[PDB]
């Protein structure tokens, strides 16, 4: 009612040859740096090529819920840090000075880390559970671990991210962690996790061994093939009946 009559809409149409185009999103059309292009093309290649099952098994990671319970359990057994190791050593020195003496005092169960340590534990059948990161970039350190764990009878699961295992062990990255013996109040939770993981991984290793990965074409190629198939199907439908 009080609107200024001088105000008006001034729409610009962006047809071809008309008013110049607006600054729109061009992320799909950016000349990207060579390293970005290389990593994206590697990701695409891992879907183009036929990935052997020994490498494709690591695409089967734990679901988010199960990974959450597993990491929640594993947080109770994180290795002791440098500061609290210093505190424990000072406490031991003070206690030995006065007056108990040796006092091993039940060295607590801890989460074992490192691919070599985990491999030795699996070979000795000491590990109760094995957790393997899915994204070990030099992927030869852990390719044998599913098979070795299956043969030795220890349950193994694959989890998303070596960074999470590294945060478990106060480092940047850990390939694998191992659950050895556990406290009594957590034995039941470990048993539940072991049952679920044995169902998901060890009991179907026979077809994990045969599930090849990759061999998927691009969306443009799939759309073109589907267009050809629909083109012949629309006339075959009229041919039939």
């Amino acid at each position: 009612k009080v609107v200024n009559p001088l105000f008006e809409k001034r729409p610009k149409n962006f047809g071809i040859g008309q008013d110049i185009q607006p600054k729109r999103d061009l992320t799909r059309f950016v000349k990207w740096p060579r390293y970005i292009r290389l990593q994206r093309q590697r990701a695409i290649l891992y879907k183009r090529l036929k990935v052997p099952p020994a490498i494709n098994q690591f695409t089967q990671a734990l679901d988010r819920q199960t990974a959450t319970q597993l990491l929640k359990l594993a947080h109770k057994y994180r290795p002791e840090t440098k500061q609290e190791k210093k505190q424990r050593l000072l406490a031991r020195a003070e206690k030995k000075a006065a007056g108990k003496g040796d006092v091993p005092t039940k060295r607590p169960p801890v989460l074992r880390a490192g691919v070599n340590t985990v491999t030795t534990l699996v070979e000795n059948k000491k590990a109760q559970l094995v957790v393997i990161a899915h994204d070990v970039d030099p992927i030869e350190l852990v390719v044998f671990l599913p098979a070795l764990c299956r043969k030795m009878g220890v349950p193994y699961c694959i989890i998303k991210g070596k960074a999470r295992l590294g945060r478990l062990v106060h480092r940047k990255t850990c390939t694998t962690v191992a659950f050895t013996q556990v406290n009594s109040e957590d034995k039941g939770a470990l048993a539940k996790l072991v049952e679920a993981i044995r169902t998901n991984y060890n009991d179907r290793y026979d077809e994990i061994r045969r599930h090849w990965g990759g061999n998927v074409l691009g969306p443009k190629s799939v759309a073109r093939i589907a267009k050809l198939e629909k083109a012949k199907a629309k006339e075959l439908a009229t041919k039939l009946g």
């Binding site: 071809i16 040859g17 110049i20 185009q21």
Partner: protein, 149 residues
């Protein structure tokens, strides 16, 4: 200098930013200054327009033909020369054309070309008549002219 075909300085508008884009088309014969030329798939058949061969009829002739779908013009560029669009097939998106040498070439239907013949006419009709005229001709081109047997 060095070519017999006149060049056409043609100014377009940049579709994405406020700027003027100047091109250096090969002048098809008949075009003049102050003339509007149109380049694209929906351009009409007129002398000087640039449009894909697949959208052109079965007997049209063209000036600055692309050898590959996307480079600039490569064929029939020398003065007086032209190519002819012989045939099409909508499937496989191919067009058969006749080159100035008389050879037949199958190219993509997306190759663009200028409608008409390139200007510069029958330049080879006039006898050179003079070693000096030949000298001036090749001085603008390269060091090839005085040819010892």
């Amino acid at each position: 200098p060095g070519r017999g075909a006149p060049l056409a300085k043609v100014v377009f508008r940049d579709p994405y930013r406020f700027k003027k884009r100047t091109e250096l088309f090969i002048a098809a014969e008949g075009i003049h200054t102050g003339q509007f030329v149109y380049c694209g798939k929906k351009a009409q058949l007129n002398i000087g327009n640039v449009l894909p061969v697949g959208t052109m009829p079965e007997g049209t002739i063209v000036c600055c033909l692309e050898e590959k779908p996307g480079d600039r013009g490569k064929l029939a560029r020398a003065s007086g020369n032209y190519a002819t669009v012989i045939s099409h097939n909508p499937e496989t998106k191919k067009t058969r054309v006749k080159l100035p040498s008389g050879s037949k070439k199958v190219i993509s239907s997306a190759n663009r070309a200028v409608v008409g013949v390139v200007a510069g006419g029958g330049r080879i009709d006039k006898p050179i008549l003079k070693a000096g005229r030949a000298y001036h001709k090749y001085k603008a081109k390269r060091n090839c002219w005085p040819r010892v047997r």
